[PDB]
């Protein structure tokens, strides 16, 4: 069924991501995001692979997609703030790390990555 089809391309892309074949993970998750487009976990894994291949401009977009579908995923906000930090959008990343602290109070990244902003 449709849920199991959207699991298959996730489970497939995860195995390429574990093998460090990040681009093949992007390809698999794209087939799922294109089949379904309503699961926040599909683009959440796609953004991680884009971030490993240093395409932070593309990783930002898939992190925003996970936040449009779910809106509560602390990992997707931490991944968007991290992408923006290497993208030069440091003031926009400050707001995303402050948002991770709403989703998990005292979050270890949401203190530390928000603290990296001030290394001026």
């Amino acid at each position: 069924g449709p849920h199991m089809q959207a699991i298959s391309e996730k489970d497939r892309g995860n195995g390429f991501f574990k093998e460090g074949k990040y681009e093949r993970a992007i390809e698999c998750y794209t087939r799922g995001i294109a089949a379904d487009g309503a699961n926040a976990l599909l683009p959440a894994n796609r953004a991680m692979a884009y971030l490993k291949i240093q395409k932070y401009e593309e990783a930002e977009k898939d992190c925003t997609q996970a936040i449009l579908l779910d809106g509560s995923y602390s990992k997707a906000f931490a991944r968007r703030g991290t992408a923006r930090t290497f993208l030069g959008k440091l003031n926009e990343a400050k707001q995303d790390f402050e948002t991770v602290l709403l989703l998990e109070p005292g979050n270890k990244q949401a203190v530390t990555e928000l603290s990296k902003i001030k290394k001026k």
Partner: peptide, 9 residues
């Protein structure tokens, strides 16, 4: 505890 960034499913 809280969520780590660098991971997939």
């Amino acid at each position: 505890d809280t969520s780590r960034m660098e991971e997939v499913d």
